[model samples]
Target: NPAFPGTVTCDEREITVEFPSSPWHASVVDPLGLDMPNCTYILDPEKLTLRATYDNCTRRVHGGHQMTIRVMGAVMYQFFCPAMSASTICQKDFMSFSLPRVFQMGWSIEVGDGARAKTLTLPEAMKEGFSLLIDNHRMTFHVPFNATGVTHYVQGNSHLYMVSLKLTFISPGQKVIFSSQAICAPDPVTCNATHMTLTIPEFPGKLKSVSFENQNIDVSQLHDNGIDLEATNGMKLHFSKTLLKTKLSEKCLLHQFYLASLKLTFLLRPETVSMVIYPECLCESPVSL
Candidate 1:
């Protein structure tokens, strides 16, 4: 009697039990107490195996029933549901497979006269998969992944006594990046005056080159009053100049003759160092009565 309690007789060869359209029902209690609305069982005599499977099982939320299993050694299992109702499940389990690296930067800017100083900060710019931070005169940029490139342009204006100018760049961790200062108060009685300062921060990686230009100053009057650049890695400086445009306008009857359009380019030893200035002016000629 291999089936024992179910009672199956075995003859000299084998014994067979058939489950027709109408099958017999049996009630058996399992330790885990999992509810099985419909179940079937199959026994293989030669293989000596019994398999039990469920067709559909449903339980109320508060029902004291669950599916449990005990493993002797280490085991890993993953469960997936194609579709679920909102009311049936309110929470979900999240597994971390991979995540992208993140980078950050900060920048700052300050402007002032001899008496009072005003400071302004640039907002962080983030787009696509890149992120950058701009504070007052300081900026901190980073790339989490491999080699990447980013170019940004920032511009602003301030009102001050206009005697001196200063620019600086620092890291987010309060480290000096770059600093430059210039003062321009030429003889008021003889020449027009202007001052400019620029700070180029020591970037984390290598900086190939940098350049600046302004399309408005007389080539003859354009001058490099002073230039200070901190060079590393055996870098040298170079300068060059190119004429862009020149024009003159005169008012004979009003006794006014002026250099109307003038454009000039000033280049340093290296192609990285360059500046352009274009100037348009109106001058009054001396008149004798």
Candidate 2:
């Protein structure tokens, strides 16, 4: 009976189940169900692990930025220098620098004669940067700077002239600045006496006009018919009878004679004189006297 009861058909007794009937059921029930036959499921734990290593090393890194420097051309203007032949009478002191930025420079000259002392300020235009050259008693200043001031020295009778200079530099945006003072004493050993004289070749028939000023004038050469007068400090015109060959017209004579007594004082001291003496002539036509 056991055999007969248990003797079900072989086909019924043998239980057959299909693989992967349901996705969720196969994934949960089957151990290797999630593994694909074409792909291997071997996992290397080293790949999942993140390990950072650091070491002591020195390296140089560069920034991706740069700057360019530009140079400007300079011009030169001679303020004071020894004359070609008067090398012993002139001397100069100078300072200069070239940089990649902006700044200001200044200088002053103080001179003392036996009688008086005067200070000459460096022109405001020359306070900027420029090229400067100094040689013994000869010097030159180059642009972008200019200088302007009195060039003539006070003439004293065999006197010593002492000169001192003060130089300064400042920068609003830079770290370095400077100021200095220097002296060149008895530069020429002696200030020479300067005297100017004018001579006329022949007198013109008629006198046109007479005009003059008290300033630096050029008397290098005398003209033929007319005379030109030049002075450095200041000048005055005085017509004396001894300076003329003939008498002037009544009107012209009266005009000069009236001004002769006034002792006119000029703009500054250290007077210079330039006179072109000519023979006076009778007035043919009454011109503007």
Candidate 3:
């Protein structure tokens, strides 16, 4: 039967299941005590087998007015709250900790100079929910593993605010990274930050070596057609295994590549990729030399 917003519907085959969260109460104070009995279930009465854990109720009402209640929602509700400080409440072994599934992980950092030296660190991740709190200049959060994007808040009395954020995710045994550089205050602006090159020391490998390079080179005056030069350079100038394989010799195969760029400023154009800075009229497109 369909239950309306302001109505309650009951059927003839009514079954009442008493649970801890929703206890049989003569008054509201009965449920508020939080001292409900531990639930037990007898799976096989003939074999004298019993289970310790039991199902709980979600709601409670006064008096047994000849109405049987049957919970229609989920089996159980699990609520998670953030810890106040770093303690036994949450702990992780970095060496043994490995991400379970393919997931996206990112964090945003906004730097402010005017205020006193204030540092903020988040508690361990909550299992089901998220916690976000900002105290004066420090912002903290304990985000769930499934959250996609997080908004970080910071307070500054100065005009210029520098924000650098990095995010990394792993899928199919491959790691993907996303990086963003933002300037706050004085009307938000995106910066062409310095490029970073990661060189892995040649270990005793069997066949190949892997290296990563992230460049934010200036290309405000170098593009083809009407494409913006800055956008072209700012866009992740990536050379992956496929592109690198075509260029490199067959004997020397490229191992892996990761290229990512973040756009902090919101563009009002209708295109999937917007052109920001136009290149000079008579210039050749800049490719890795």
Which one is best on lDDT? Answer: 1
- Every model's TM-score: 0.18, 0.16, 0.16
lDDT, candidate 1, 1-289, per-residue tens: 0112222211112222222232133222233444344634455554433233222221212311111111113221111111100000000111011111111434333334444554434442123122234544333332221111212111222110111112223233221212112111111111122212222222222223332343333333224522223345311222221221223334322322122221112232332212111222224443345
- Could you give candidate 2's per-residue lDDT for residues 28-57 as a string of tens digits? 111222322232122223332111111111
lDDT of 3 by residue, 1-289 (tens): 3221111212111212223232222111112333234322223334322122212322323311122222233122121111111100111110011111222333222222235322232322222233434334333333332232322322232122223223233223222233232222221122122221211112111111111133232334222212122222122222222212112223333322222222222222321111111111111223343
Q: Could you tell me how far off, in angstroms, the CA of residue 78 lies in candidate 3 after the best superposition?
A: 46
The RMSD of every model to the true structure, in order and in angstroms, is: 28.7, 38.8, 21.6
* Cα lDDT, all candidates: 0.24, 0.23, 0.23
Residue 218 CA error for candidate 1 (Å)? 15
Q: Per-prediction count of colliding residue pairs?
A: 26, 9, 1
Given candidate 3, what's the lDDT at residue 249?
27
Candidate 1, run of 10 with poorest lDDT: 82-91
Best by TM-score: 1
Model 1 spans > 4 angstroms off: 1-104, 123-163, 177-276, 280-289
* True-vs-predicted CA distance for residue 225, candidate 1, Å: 19
What is the Cα-based lDDT of residue 181 in candidate 3? 27
lDDT of 1: 0.24
